[model samples]
Target: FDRQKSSFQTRFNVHREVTPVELPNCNLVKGIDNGSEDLEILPNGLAFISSGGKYPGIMSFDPDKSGKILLMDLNEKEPAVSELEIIGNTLDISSFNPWGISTFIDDDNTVYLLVVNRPGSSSTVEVFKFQEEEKSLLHLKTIRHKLLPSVNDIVAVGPEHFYATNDHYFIDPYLKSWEMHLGLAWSFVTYYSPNDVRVVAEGFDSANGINISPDGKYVYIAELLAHKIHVYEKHANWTLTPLRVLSFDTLVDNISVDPVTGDLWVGCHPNGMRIFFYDAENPPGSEVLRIQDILSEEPKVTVVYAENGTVLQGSSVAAVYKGKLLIGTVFHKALYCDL
Candidate 1:
């Protein structure tokens, strides 16, 4: 019991604290008070934000409200968000608890969104078609499989195909808590498609975020409690081979890849204890790390932003569009800054 407790502490980074890294001209994004747990930005400056996620053990600011996907135009001088209307009868709007989101733009320029959603205790990946002119999302289909028992995040490669991270092996809240506390490391990543679904990677200490390189030759999976990001070489047969692993002091959440520079912008939790166990007096701090030249021998990792939860708390994802940076939290307001 003593050993297990200490291991849990290390996994959670219970003693870690943040040192502020400030950026000039940072402003809190309007109309995103509940949360922006994950976001994806297209090349044309449009962003889709997933908000109001409710996880089993995590803190939720707006527990009574359902989740929504908000749209923002980064090209604007002072961008603002508008909730995207869901125009299909396939999904249950009342239980729309979105977690991580990814956008896939096809060769014909049709944008598809795959969202990880937890309606109640079960998990499902909702596929939607982005209607740009109407400023709405047309629900296409809902995917649920035994392999994706507890999906945390997804990186979409096609309209209905992607690699997803299963943050926990068990779906039951009681068993999940025990599995995490006992350091089981049973979390894995699965590749799903219309015809096939398989586990591409396994044995992670809570696989949280999944993303791909700009060139589509590599895959990045964030092991949350392990504080490491593993890079995998992608193959033609939809398989991944482990290449390298990058370790971090903070708990890495969602990973956003810059399509132009291939740099990784990651949001993190500096203190995991505070995020899992919410206390307004001692809130969870946010951290963002930018990794450049990740395939090189010595990848450059810089702290792009860090704070002690005074302004923004529990940042889960960060992405860059042109020179602007958007940082999103799990259950707090979003931050937009000039980078």
Candidate 2:
């Protein structure tokens, strides 16, 4: 496989709309700013958001928890309700982001969570495993690989093992670097093996939040920077080769695999705009930046045939599920289609 480090460029607008949707749902917890990143759903049908800007380090909300629809019309340029109360700290999220969070429950119903915090530009993924027995989170261990780069997200299968990616490595001016060489496709997979945490390769351009198939035969990873999704065969030995790539019409930020429908629910945006405002112009008055919110979707699946074998199909801007997909671009509190 050609592991040649690729190079490209992207300019972001802070107030652009990453997608285009008509009927938007704004029932989610608003006031979520900064690094709201990605979200996940619990098996019990409850929804939670991962916010990192003005709110706490993270917030968990049961969208069905009984609250008046505070639908702040995006049609209006100004916000009606502009305040919220989060649970943690309100801080800046730089390169070393304590980003993407996930949980794994054992057969006995013990829940273990892992957070990826890189600190600055250090190329190491610190896995903070929270034990169910302790009832609090403590540092479990750190994944020290030679070129781990900046870990974008992690996927846990069995309690004993999982996989992670280096995302894309950029030159940190604060670190005094020459230029950006764009590291891994955010697709490479490394794990906490029975021996040690080793990298299992997934040939692609970039990758983000990954979830393995419930059947344990396939692993689906989202490639953000590359605007695509790649699937690989899940082997017990962790010896994986390039399989198939599902290209989306828009940029794929993250993907959540629906346990029921093998359907890949991907989080996306146009370029790299990570902030948005509700537009209140007309028909609701929406003051959104098209540059930032051009949300679309592509229902795709890569069927694994054999070793190094697969096929990609399906495409769309996804059905307008909840809040304007544009909100997903600027605000980071989107996961699962709110029913």
Candidate 3:
């Protein structure tokens, strides 16, 4: 039995294959390990990537100093992808590691970067704003936040406000986690103001990747370990309180919103590297049911099939670009495909 097989089949085409390709002219940064953990699209179709999982210690309290936030001008080339320069760095954005990244763009061509400080010695979902200065993203200001119990991924909702991103990457180094005593894990999703980051959602089990609806009606959160996507109503603008919950077992990484279609695209790994596109909804919610297991014919209640695709290796973060689809897996820096 397939754990993540869903009743929905996308209206669009989706598949994978091997073929010839032309890569971009990339300038790889020396010494820094490139782990494309998260991906998001800019207003101009530019691609941004975050690196993580390089931290070599969870038991010894050791921190990996080789972390970074790199951006690429996708229009330049494919496969020839060059290294993006760092903004402000004292010790390469010191934290346990950056898990997921989202960008907020202003009219002045500036970008605000939101990243999760996944659990370790240091934990916080730090906010950074960058001003564009012809060809590179220059650091303007950095706001350090202290979201306790560890954080994983983050998403920006509005000005001076964003949602916390989180999940468990498995604490292999710390073996004393039977009671979760060693790794020090917890859910830290927040609806925050620039002055204070308020804890919005908590008590999540092995979850990551979060986003709010276009109308801000509900907050959609995914539980990776639970194999479901939970929904919380936008209780209030000041407070982000999720109300209902939805499930989809086979998923990984963050959810991407399509401005054109107004649909939510989730990049999941539980069923191989794949993207799950869904229309927003609110139901009474259920218990102990796998999303992919329900065989339904109703479009509204029974889960209407939509456009989806799969990658051979499950990628944590997936993003759609101007001419291609971008994703991060255990295989390569950013695995992307074109029509």
Candidate 4:
């Protein structure tokens, strides 16, 4: 394959692209469960999608199925109308709920996956390495921190080093009740390394998703409850300094970086969380926002895709995959929105 110009340069043009068509056949796991909480794409043009239902921290419930990682081929246009294959799974275990996922291919040609595992007692980042010959993931190790109360999402910068967002500070049942009741802003961002783990920044209303610029110079963090993207400057010592906050009018979930442009694409809940958990008559709406010139002094915001019809709803992530949009959701089926 020749190394040509980045295809994403022409993939998505906010002003030119037409309305997204609803993608079907997302019920890969049959009629049991379907939810791509987060996803990460590899250089091979395959996007690994994490599937699981939402969990209310203070409440206890049973999941219909275990967590699964769906392997979707994003190289072709409207590739297939069938369910994708599961490359990784937790069998029928409910405690092994996979939330956020990040993929990294090392110099040794080894694939490393980091996922936010939401067990009841503690939050953990479970690391797994891909075994290509077997076409599955071998569990490596679990990373946890005493200070990491409620881990939301992670962005793996390296096989050993990554950044995670702590969505909430208190994890106890009683504490979580008061925390969510008052809408506290005690969430923070943490940098996890092999030998050390520490909070890099704090004071976010709800730190949901984290992404780094392609150049590795800046970090874009999605503050969920506040509807803001907190930008930070990264130092050589791995310290983060506050840069600026980009405000939006919607509730943002996971954030994805455009590899070619270093711009950020976020899946938003247009109707907010209240209508999402309750109000069954009016379900939550989905919207995808693209933040352009993210590293510049004045970044631009554009609505790349929204709920044009009933197909896309309550999106969590809108990642760029092979010149198309790999949209994940919390309520409805995920979509491969053509550019």
Candidate 5:
């Protein structure tokens, strides 16, 4: 019993604390008070943010309201977020609980947004087309499969295809809690397409964020509870071969890859205890890590931003556009910094 308790503490990084890293020019993003759990920035400086996620033990600012995707233009002098209207009869807007999101720009420059959603206790991946002129999202399809029981994040490779991380093996909330407590390590990653879907990787202690390299040659999967990120070489057949694994002291969440420089920007939780068990007096801390030349022998990992819950709490993702950095939280306000 004592061994299991200690293992859980290590997995959750209970002893970790944030060492503040300050940026000269930083501001709280306006009009986003609920949560920006995950975000993806396009090459054209437009960003898509998923907000209002309600997980099992996580906090939710707006529990009664459904989640929505917010848009922001990073090219502007001061970027402000606007909620994107969903126009489709196929989806039930009231049950839309958006979590992690990814954008894929095809050769024809058509942008597709893939969102991980948990309506009730079941998981589904929703595909939407970005209507630039309308400034809205056209619901394309709702994908649900047995392999993707409890998806946490996705990296869209095609308009209808992607790689997803299953954060838990069981979909039932009661079973999921026990699975997490017992350290089952049954969470895995899957490659999903129209004609084929298969588990590409397995044995992860809560797989959370997933992203791909700029060249599409490698895929990165963040093991949240294990405090590690695994890099896999992507083959033509969509099969992944393990290449390397990078371990961290903090719990890594969503990963954002720089399209131009191929660097990784990761949002993390300094202490997971406060995140699952929320307390206003002692809230969770946020941290962002920037990794350069990850494939090299000595990859440089820098703590770009770190702070206690004083300003922003529970940061889940960090993405950069040009020189500006946008750090998002799971259930708090977002931070924009000049990098």
Candidate 6:
């Protein structure tokens, strides 16, 4: 898997026409500004979204304050959204671009916000404690490592222990385009404890999203380019064993587990490997599915919501919360629909 030696950055130069298709209960929800690449919902009807600037590749993006972490009170009649001014940040304020986020609440009622912020070549996990009474994010700590440069998404199993995905296997960011175009399986999953960080599994085709079962026995990782779900059996020493793999027709972006039912929910990019806005002329669509009894030998899967971009484009993550669906996108405003 020497990516430096790898070549052949494939391209689909054909034009795709925009078409409108509808899902029975799916519709766009307004008020979220610009970018919402990741979505996390709490049991108390609070949802957090991470917004980052348009990824124009290795050195094209302007690192600015456009990156923000927003909170929405889903219980509100109109659902007002507010931005969290991260207090006590050690990093430079100008480069605080936040991406892939995960929320965990302790039994003692403390909210832990885990986010991957990369304003430059380096990446780090900015941990925050959300005080509900004050509705503010108190900066707790930042986790950085040489191995965390390519982290795409993270899941917090404990306040200090979590699993993060290295989306690209190669150190050279340029090869990432080739990996996606050629569909390479070089990325891997990593586990971080308070003492050390370690790679738990390797040889994944663009490992994107990660999560652990409610009981903390099984771990799930989404292979975006491979369009499959890799399920693993969790070990006490922060290791994982292959349990099963679920295949799909579209690119699997993120994985969300229902806290009460343990069913796995994922958002799919129906238009597969068409790179960005080049082949993105067609309206983007969102495809979400729920795998019931994901721990079983053969899990039952259902397509909960399938939209053909009539309402929204580019579905990156779909989260189920409080009898409703909260959909996110790599670009554009978030959507809300009643189940």
List clashing residue pairs in candidate 4.
none
Better of 3 and 5 by lDDT: 5
Q: What is candidate 5's TM-score against the reference?
A: 0.99
How well does model 3 score by local distance difference test?
0.49
TM-score of 1: 0.98
Question: Across residues 1-339, which tens digit of lDDT does each residue of candidate 1 receive?
Answer: 888788888999999989999988899998998889999999999999998788887787766867899999999999999999998989998888899999999999999999999988999999999999999999999999999999999999999999999999999989999998888999999999989999999999999988999889999999999999999999999999999999999999999999999889999998889888999999988899999999899999999999998899999999999899999999999999998
- Candidate 2 lands at a TM-score of 0.60
Model 5 C-alpha lDDT per residue in residues 259-313, reported as the tens digit of each score: 8899999999989898878898999989999999998999999999999989999
Of the pair 4 and 5, which is ahead by TM-score?
5
Candidate 4 lDDT over residue span 1-339, tens digit each:
122122211111112212453343332223223577788877777677787645563111234555666676577555432223334454224577788888777889888888888876578888888765555677767787876678889988888578999888888757865675466678889998987788899988778989998888998899876778988998887889999888876778999988888879998766553323544454455678888997678788988777642555567888876557777876456777655
Off by over 4 Å in 6: 1-27, 56-65, 274-280
Q: Lowest-scoring 10 consecutive residues by lDDT in candidate 6?
A: 7-16
Each model's lDDT comes to 0.93, 0.42, 0.49, 0.71, 0.93, 0.75
TM-score on alpha carbons, each prediction: 0.98, 0.60, 0.65, 0.83, 0.99, 0.88
Please state the error at residue 127 of candidate 5 in Å: 0.6
Stretches of candidate 4 exceeding 4 Å from the true structure = 1-33, 57-62, 77-94, 274-276
RMSD of 6: 4.0
lDDT digits (tens) for residues 38-154 of candidate 2: 444445432223344221111223322211111222333333333122112322223324455555767887654555665544544443433323333444555555545656667
Q: Point out the higher-scoring one by lDDT: 1 or 2.
A: 1
Model 5 clash pairs are none
Evaluate residue 196 in candidate 2 and report its C-alpha lDDT on the 0 to 100 scale: 72
